[PDB]
Write a protein that binds this ligand. Structure first.
Ligand SMILES: O=C(O)c1cc(F)c(-c2nn(C(=O)c3c(Cl)cccc3C(F)(F)F)c3cccnc23)cc1O
Length: 241
């Protein structure tokens, strides 16, 4: 009935529609783990072939997040500068949070190209510290056993943050932020899940991992550029020069 319960439903609708795999598909496929021969197959690939595979999965993942953001009540109504500011700082942070759904804490593997594989699968990329940091972040997030609605509401808040440097209409973003915080806290009370609030990762940690990740992606993109058919061209122009 309330404007808030309608917001909860729409955020969860936007989320469910902008998700590539459904949680049950990822959950059932946990048994389908890459063989040592398949692992060796991936480790023996060139850095540049592994970069191409990962770059295209990450760009497709960002594209689903841009679509998620576009479907968030109020986003399209913000100025284009603000829309860029929010997506530039937050789209990859959302991708990093969404990744915990495809992560298995039991064996420390991620669902990649049809099967579950460990971080060793990525050996050829030569950025083990970064990749270990990503798996660690997914490991901490997997302990929360986040529900699909919780991930939807939390990621909307990762994106709609009025504290991002460069916002031109801070107040309009704050209004959207306040409504989403109410939606999230209202839903956690209703479901007796307010306990996750003290367990969420510190804001600086997600920011920090994201900045390290995007910085590496930028280094690879400079060395071996991939072209992408941009869903949001003004955002695309801010990262792809
Ligand atoms: O409009 C689009 O279709 C669009 C696609 C994108 F993938 C991003 C995107 N890629 N990306 C990358 O880090 C990236 C990715 Cl995901 C793959 C390779 C290189 C890059 C890096 F470094 F060159 F930009 C981002 C980081 C934050 C925020 N957005 C992005 C942005 C877009 O506007």
């Amino acid at each position: 009935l309330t404007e808030i319960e309608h917001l909860v439903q729409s955020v969860c609708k936007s989320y469910r529609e902008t998700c590539q795999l459904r949680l049950e598909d990822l959950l059932r496929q946990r048994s389908n783990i890459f063989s040592r021969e398949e692992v060796t197959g991936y480790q023996r690939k060139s850095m540049w072939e592994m970069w191409e595979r990962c770059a295209h999965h990450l760009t497709e993942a960002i594209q689903y997040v841009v679509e998620f953001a576009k479907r968030l009540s109020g986003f399209m109504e913000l100025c284009q500068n603000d829309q860029i500011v929010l997506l530039k700082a937050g789209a990859m942070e959302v991708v990093l949070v969404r990744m915990c759904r495809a992560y298995n804490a039991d064996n420390r593997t991620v669902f990649f190209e049809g099967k579950y594989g460990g971080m060793e699968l990525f050996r050829a990329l030569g950025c083990s510290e970064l990749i270990s940091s990503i798996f660690d972040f997914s490991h901490s997030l997997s302990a929360l056993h986040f529900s699909e609605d919780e991930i939807a509401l939390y990621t909307a808040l990762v994106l709609i943050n009025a504290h991002r440097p460069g916002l031109q209409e801070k107040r309009k973003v704050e209004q959207l932020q306040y409504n989403l915080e109410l939606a999230f806290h209202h839903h956690l009370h209703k479901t007796h899940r307010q306990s996750i609030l003290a367990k969420l990762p510190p804001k600086g940690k997600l920011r920090s991992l994201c900045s390290q990740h995007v910085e590496r992606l930028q280094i690879f993109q400079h060395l071996h550029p991939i072209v992408v058919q941009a869903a949001f061209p003004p955002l695309y122009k801010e990262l792809f020069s």
